Amino acid sequence: METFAFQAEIAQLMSLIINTFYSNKEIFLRELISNSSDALDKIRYESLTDPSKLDSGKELHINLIPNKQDRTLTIVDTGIGMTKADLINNLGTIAKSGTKAFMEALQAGADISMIGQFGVGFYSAYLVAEKVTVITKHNDDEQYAWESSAGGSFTVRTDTGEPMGRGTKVILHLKEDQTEYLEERRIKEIVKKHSQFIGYPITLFVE
Numbered sequence: 476m477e478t479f480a481f482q483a484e485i486a487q488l489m490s491l492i493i494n495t496f497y498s499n500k501e502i503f504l505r506e507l508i509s510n511s512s513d514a515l516d517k518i519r520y521e522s523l524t525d526p527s528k529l530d531s532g533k534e535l536h537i538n539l540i541p542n543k544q545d546r547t548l549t550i551v552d553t554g555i556g557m558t559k560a561d562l563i564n565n566l567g568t569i570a571k572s573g574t575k576a577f578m579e580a581l582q583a584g585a586d587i588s589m590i591g592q593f594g595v596g597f598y599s600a601y602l603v604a605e606k607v608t609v610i611t612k613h614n615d616d617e618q619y620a621w622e623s624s625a626g627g628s629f630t631v632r633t634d635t636g637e638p639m640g641r642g643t644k645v646i647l648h649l650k651e652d653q654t655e656y657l658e659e660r661r662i663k664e665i666v667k668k669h670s671q672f673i674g675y676p677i678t679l680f681v682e
């Protein structure tokens with residue numbers, strides 16, 4: 476396991492998301508489903524030029540998996556996935572520029588719910604999660620786990636868990652007071668409100 480320091484801007488945004496009083500937390504799910512939809516659009520479009528890009532799995536879908544025992548909500552997609560260079564380097568560049576634009580928009584009066592317009596909607600996960608684990612597999616790299624509890628740090632390691640084929644899993648280790656996001660009725664309500672027109676099947680698993 477390798478440990479990395481967040482740069483100052485994204486660290487400040489993570490603190491803002493964790494510390495600011497903001498009741499409309501449910502938008503995290505819309506943001507993660509939108510990210511999954513974008514990752515699925517990316518592999519689908521690349522497959523139109525190279526169909527062998529789907530040799531790692533033809534199915535293009537999004538699954539929402541609650542686990543009350545573990546207190547986790549997992550968003551799984553079979554999208555393009557992320558390489559190690561995406562996790563450490565490329566997304567660090569995006570996190571910096573998107574945070575600077577979002578902070579400029581917030582100081583002006585924008586709402587936390589607009590985070591996805593700045594390309595950093597992933598970070599809305601910290602509205603509900605004390606820790607986020609991202610398991611990912613891109614066709615051109617190995618399976619990796621990125622993880623952070625906001626210490627000013629994150630970790631990256633090769634993942635020895637169940638092999639994924641291709642795509643990303645975002646595991647939300649929920650805060651103690653955010654267990655409503657494990658309830659079937661609550662998840663169904665949020666998906667219907669914010670994500671009813673996503674162009675991939677969204678399966679809400681139950682227990």
Ligand SMILES: O=C1c2ccccc2-c2c1cccc2-c1nc2cnccc2[nH]1
Binds near residue numbers: 510561562566568
């Ligand atoms: O979906 C996203 C996402 C969306 C937008 C920005 C970053 C991420 C992101 C994501 C998933 C896994 C890791 C990162 C990530 N944030 C970083 C911050 N500083 C250094 C490396 C980093 N890598």
